[PDB]
Amino acid sequence: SHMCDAFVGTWKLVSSENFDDYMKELGVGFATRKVAGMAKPNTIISVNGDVITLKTESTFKNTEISFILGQEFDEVTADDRKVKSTITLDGGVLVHVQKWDGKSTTLKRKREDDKLVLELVMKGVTCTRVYERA
Numbered sequence: 001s002h003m004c005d006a007f008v009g010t011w012k013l014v015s016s017e018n019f020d021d022y023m024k025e026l027g028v029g030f031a032t033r034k035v036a037g038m039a040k041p042n043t044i045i046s047v048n049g050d051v052i053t054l055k056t057e058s059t060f061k062n063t064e065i066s067f068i069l070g071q072e073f074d075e076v077t078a079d080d081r082k083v084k085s086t087i088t089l090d091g092g093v094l095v096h097v098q099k100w101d102g103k104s105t106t107l108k109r110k111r112e113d114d115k116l117v118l119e120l121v122m123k124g125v126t127c128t129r130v131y132e133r134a
């Protein structure tokens with residue numbers, strides 16, 4: 001009944017490119033990068049009314065965010081950044097912006113074929129994370 005229905009479900013990571021380099025650009029330290037980089041998260045997306053929930057489950061860290069499109073919220077990220085986040089739906093792409101300490105990173109999620117593709121950008125570094133249905 002909504003366009004964002006295409007994102008709902010349970011998703012598993014199938015490939016990753018440039019995640020270590022993205023985390024370096026974020027300022028994540030060595031041990032966290034190693035552990036986080038080994039993770040194989042699942043992402044569970046649900047919608048209930050105007051509220052979207054995105055859970056991330058892994059052996060490293062489990063996260064859960066609930067939010068309304070366009071409405072800012074405070075988020076503690078898996079690497080323990082305290083950020084101010086806003087998520088919008090722009091031409092079919094979920095656009096998640098995180099701001100902290102005068103920095104910004106953007107996470108875009110889109111459906112491409114049977115995949116859910118997450119792109120994360122910090123400065124000039126782009127990481128691509130491809131998820132498939134569980």
Ligand SMILES: O=c1cc(O)ccn1Cc1ccccc1Oc1ccccc1
Pocket residue numbers: 013023036037039040041056057058060061062063077078079118120129
């Ligand atoms: O939510 C996601 C999901 C990813 O696949 C890749 C990155 N992030 C956000 C993220 C940024 C930096 C460090 C970790 C992190 O999220 C996780 C969470 C659990 C496991 C791996 C990455």
